[PDB]
Amino acid sequence: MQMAYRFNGIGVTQNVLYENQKLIANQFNSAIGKIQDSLSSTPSALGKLQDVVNHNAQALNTLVKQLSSKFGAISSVLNDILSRLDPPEAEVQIDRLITGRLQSLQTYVTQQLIRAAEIRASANLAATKMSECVLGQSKRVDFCGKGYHLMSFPQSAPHGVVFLHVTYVPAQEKNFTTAPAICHDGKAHFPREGVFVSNGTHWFVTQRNFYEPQIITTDNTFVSGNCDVVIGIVNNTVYDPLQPELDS
Amino acid sequence: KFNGLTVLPPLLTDEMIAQYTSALLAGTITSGWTFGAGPALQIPFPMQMAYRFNGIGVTQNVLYENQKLIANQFNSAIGKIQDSLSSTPSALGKLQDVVNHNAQALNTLVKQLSSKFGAISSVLNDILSRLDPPEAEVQIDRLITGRLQSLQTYVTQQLIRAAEIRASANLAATKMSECVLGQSKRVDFCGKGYH
Amino acid sequence: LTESNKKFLPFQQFGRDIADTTDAVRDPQTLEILDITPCSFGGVSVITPGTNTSNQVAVLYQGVNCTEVNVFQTRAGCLIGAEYVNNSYECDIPIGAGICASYQTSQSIIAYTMSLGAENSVAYSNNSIAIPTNFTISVTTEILPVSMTKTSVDCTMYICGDSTECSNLLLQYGSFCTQLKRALTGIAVEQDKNTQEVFAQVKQIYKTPPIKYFGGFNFSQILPDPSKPSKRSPIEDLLFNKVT
Amino acid sequence: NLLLQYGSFCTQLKRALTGIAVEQDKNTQEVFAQVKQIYKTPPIKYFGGF
Numbered sequence: 001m002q003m004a005y006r007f008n009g010i011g012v013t014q015n016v017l018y019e020n021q022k023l024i025a026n027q028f029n030s031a032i033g034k035i036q037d038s039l040s041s042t043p044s045a046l047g048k049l050q051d052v053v054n055h056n057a058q059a060l061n062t063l064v065k066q067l068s069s070k071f072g073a074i075s076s077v078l079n080d081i082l083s084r085l086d087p088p089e090a091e092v093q094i095d096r097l098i099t100g101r102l103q104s105l106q107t108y109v110t111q112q113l114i115r116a117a118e119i120r121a122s123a124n125l126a127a128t129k130m131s132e133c134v135l136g137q138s139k140r141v142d143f144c145g146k147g148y149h150l151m152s153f154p155q156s157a158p159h160g161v162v163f164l165h166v167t168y169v170p171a172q173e174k175n176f177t178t179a180p181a182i183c184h185d186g187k188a189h190f191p192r193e194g195v196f197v198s199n200g201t202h203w204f205v206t207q208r209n210f211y212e213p214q215i216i217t218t219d220n221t222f223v224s225g226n227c228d229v230v231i232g233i234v235n236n237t238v239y240d241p242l243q244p245e246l247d248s
Numbered sequence: 249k250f251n252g253l254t255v256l257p258p259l260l261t262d263e264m265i266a267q268y269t270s271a272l273l274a275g276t277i278t279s280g281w282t283f284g285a286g287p288a289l290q291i292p293f294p295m296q297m298a299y300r301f302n303g304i305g306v307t308q309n310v311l312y313e314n315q316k317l318i319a320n321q322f323n324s325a326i327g328k329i330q331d332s333l334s335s336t337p338s339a340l341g342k343l344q345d346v347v348n349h350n351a352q353a354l355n356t357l358v359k360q361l362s363s364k365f366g367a368i369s370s371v372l373n374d375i376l377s378r379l380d381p382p383e384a385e386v387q388i389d390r391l392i393t394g395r396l397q398s399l400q401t402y403v404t405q406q407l408i409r410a411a412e413i414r415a416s417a418n419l420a421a422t423k424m425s426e427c428v429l430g431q432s433k434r435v436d437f438c439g440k441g442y443h
Numbered sequence: 444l445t446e447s448n449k450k451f452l453p454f455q456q457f458g459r460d461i462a463d464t465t466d467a468v469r470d471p472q473t474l475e476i477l478d479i480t481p482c483s484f485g486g487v488s489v490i491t492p493g494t495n496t497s498n499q500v501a502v503l504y505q506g507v508n509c510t511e512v513n514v515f516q517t518r519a520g521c522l523i524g525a526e527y528v529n530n531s532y533e534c535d536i537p538i539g540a541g542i543c544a545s546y547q548t549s550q551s552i553i554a555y556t557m558s559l560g561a562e563n564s565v566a567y568s569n570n571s572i573a574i575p576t577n578f579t580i581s582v583t584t585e586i587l588p589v590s591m592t593k594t595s596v597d598c599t600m601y602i603c604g605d606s607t608e609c610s611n612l613l614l615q616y617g618s619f620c621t622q623l624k625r626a627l628t629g630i631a632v633e634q635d636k637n638t639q640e641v642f643a644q645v646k647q648i649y650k651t652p653p654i655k656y657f658g659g660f661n662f663s664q665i666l667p668d669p670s671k672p673s674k675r676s677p678i679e680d681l682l683f684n685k686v687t
Numbered sequence: 688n689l690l691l692q693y694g695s696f697c698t699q700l701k702r703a704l705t706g707i708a709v710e711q712d713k714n715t716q717e718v719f720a721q722v723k724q725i726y727k728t729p730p731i732k733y734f735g736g737f
């Protein structure tokens with residue numbers, strides 16, 4: 001029933017769900033099954049988290065390497081700069097080492113601050129995606145997966161979150177002849193929801209997202225104007241449900 | 249900007265970018281928002297505009313009975329966009345600011361090569377041919393430190409600017425997804441008025 | 444040195460441009476103007492498939508004209524060892540300026556102009572509309588980093604180990620050893636806040652009913668698995684196994 | 688030679704610049720490569736008066 005809620009949300013009537021409940025359940029189950037196989041693939045789609053981990057490790061290792069660097073001094077060793085040189089020259093050598101290593105620390109902290117800003121941007125995006133994809137149904141286009149968003153599921157991952165976006169994708173299009181409106185008695189009828197289509201001889205009114213034709217009546221259409229101003233209006237007959245019941 | 253500094257060409261040429269924008273325009277014109285959610289489904293453009301009017305809360309008959317006036321208004325507004333983009337030079341000035349900032353950074357680095365940095369000379373060969381090599385190592389080391397600090401601060405500022413540009417590109421991609429590939433209900437996200 | 448069309452005033456010797464780099468020189472013996480161009484240089488990229496595929500590579504000298512070094516010339520530089528086909532496929536290895544490279548077939552390395560996608564024409568008409576008759580339910584994936592590793596640094600210990608003659612002089616570099624610590628502490632607190640914002644979004648802790656029948660939909664792949672020591676779903680378990 | 692007792696400074700800087708350079712192409716692709724195919728308008732450019 002909440003799947004019917006969500007189908008109504010994306011613009012499809014809920015009888016489409018109720019009449020295809022087992023087909024939709026099977027499609028969802030097959031897609032969920034294929035997700036696990038897709039993740040366990042050679043591209044290793046878990047690239048962002050691995051890149052974050054590798055960047056952190058590389059920064060730490062570079063900071064470690066910067067210790068064993070003379071920075072223009074006699075040597076990078078702690079005691080060997082004092083057990084050999086005199087206190088006066090050892091003073092400037094220690095100054096050289098201190099400036100170099102504190103510069104390394106400052107550079108590392110600056111890079112970490114920039115990377116933390118980037119990670120905070122990503123985390124804010126993930127938070128809004130959790131709020132709008134998971135805690136609700138999003139009408140934003142391509143925000144929550146590709147297609148008409150139906151729902152979403154979160155999955156924790158090391159230093160990240162994985163969203164499984166369930167979306168509704170149209171599959172088998174058919175071409176029809178359409179019309180902005182139709183005429184019955186010098187009146188112009190526009191569809192309340194859906195569009196007017198023709199299979200070649202008859203005219204029906206469907207919903208815009210799924211081909212479910214219905215007979216054009218005074219319940220699916222509303223009248224506004226006449227057959228004078230609408231460019232492309234087509235003659236037809238508009239069934240009145242009141243006539244058979246009143247005559248009988 | 250050519251003293252050890254290189255400008256790499258972008259992977260996507262302007263020909264390809266124009267092709268992508270042409271594809272997006274053709275999809276929007278010939279299918280509406282349907283090509284951004286799945287297969288492209290053809291729809292007469294007046295009917296697509298009626299869809300969009302219905303989406304902003306205005307019934308279809310308002311479009312269909314005012315189709316010529318709306319088409320004329322759209323054409324006039326597009327012509328005015330052409331004229332406005334032609335004039336008022338500080339309108340498309342964000343891209344110019346980006347280009348100018350990059351050029352400023354590059355030129356600052358290149359002419360910061362010429363800085364003395366407290367050394368006796370700004371040319372390595374002047375030190376190597378005027379002061380004896382055994383004690384020229386101190387001057388060479390201080391010049392190296394100066395140039396290394398200059399390059400490091402250039403790289404850090406490039407990283408900050410790249411973060412700013414990444415934010416702008418993320419916003420532009422979101423706007424392409426939401427305003428171009430669909431119709432947005434978010435206020436003022438896709439321009440003033442009802443999108 | 445090359446012949447130049449510049450018009451130095453009779454008293455001018457050097458020649459410069461922006462950033463003050465010598466661009467031209469007047470020759471002392473014979474009065475001529477020679478333009479100076481820096482000797483060619485540039486990075487050397489190696490276009491390679493995986494070593495699990497082949498040990499054969501192509502070499503891109505970027506920016507370098509194909510005269511200071513099969514030999515193809517792209518706007519990104521000169522390519523050596525890759526044959527330029529006239530076809531167009533999706534980009535496998537991006538070289539630049541619209542040119543990509545791949546390992547294809549004579550199983551070798553080819554270079555081409557990348558294709559932007561399959562060409563498609565929409566059957567537009569005044570009164571024709573395409574309406575779907577069926578549909579599919581598609582589950583896609585988005586991976587999003589939320590936090591990094593929180594790291595603290597002991598500046599006094601890092602700069603040198605057991606040494607007081609360090610700290611005596613280092614004290615004169617005032618506040619540099621605490622500003623970095625403050626910045627790192629801020630970063631760590633921000634990481635914790637990032638995780639809190641992303642995940643701590645429910646006041647209650649909800650539980651699925653013991654009967655996991657939801658109208659035919661099967662959530663066993665995403666629901667917690669009690670069998671594992673950690674109550675992680677099979678997908679979550681796979682994610683933790685993969686990223687190590 | 689003196690520069691190479693610094694060592695990882697230049698590798699750090701080169702890697703950072705390469706990351707920026709590849710992120711630029713990532714940005715451009717993320718913005719413009721929205722569409723899976725390449726659509727073309729029909730040879731008749733009549734769209735109801737627009």
Ligand SMILES: *[C@@H]1O[C@H](CO)[C@@H](O)[C@H](O)[C@H]1NC(C)=O
Nearest residue numbers: 173174175176565566571573
């Ligand atoms: C409908 O018919 C037109 C007429 O040629 C065709 O171009 C279009 O592709 C058809 N729609 C389909 C097959 O979905």
Ligand SMILES: *[C@@H]1O[C@H](CO)[C@@H](O)[C@H](O)[C@H]1NC(C)=O
Nearest residue numbers: 198199200201202203204213
């Ligand atoms: C169109 O209308 C109905 C389809 O439900 C059918 O009775 C009629 O034969 C159809 N005509 C065609 C397909 O030409």
Ligand SMILES: *[C@@H]1O[C@H](CO)[C@@H](O)[C@H](O)[C@H]1NC(C)=O
Nearest residue numbers: 183184186227233234235236
């Ligand atoms: C049928 O449509 C034509 C225009 O296409 C119109 O002139 C005619 O009056 C319509 N038929 C009736 C009975 O009104």
Ligand SMILES: *[C@@H]1O[C@H](CO)[C@@H](O)[C@H](O)[C@H]1NC(C)=O
Nearest residue numbers: 453469470471472473474475
């Ligand atoms: C230098 O001597 C050569 C030899 O004849 C002569 O051609 C040239 O004009 C002289 N240049 C100057 C500046 O005296």
Ligand SMILES: *[C@@H]1O[C@H](CO)[C@@H](O)[C@H](O)[C@H]1NC(C)=O
Nearest residue numbers: 507508509510516517518520
């Ligand atoms: C490389 O040099 C050759 C001649 O030296 C010529 O094709 C052109 O100047 C360069 N090629 C380019 C820019 O594609």
Ligand SMILES: *[C@@H]1O[C@H](CO)[C@@H](O)[C@H](O)[C@H]1NC(C)=O
Nearest residue numbers: 023027171172576577578579
């Ligand atoms: C719709 O597609 C499903 C498989 O995706 C198929 O089993 C079913 O028969 C199709 N129905 C129609 C009306 O095309």
Ligand SMILES: *[C@@H]1O[C@H](CO)[C@@H](O)[C@H](O)[C@H]1NC(C)=O
Nearest residue numbers: 029033660661662663664677
């Ligand atoms: C749900 O899917 C799992 C596979 O992940 C399967 O083992 C289980 O039997 C399914 N549940 C059903 C069919 O009720």
Ligand SMILES: *[C@@H]1O[C@H](CO)[C@@H](O)[C@H](O)[C@H]1NC(C)=O
Nearest residue numbers: 568569570731732733734735
């Ligand atoms: C109907 O379509 C034709 C091409 O099929 C084109 O001229 C235009 O879109 C419409 N005709 C007129 C006269 O506007």
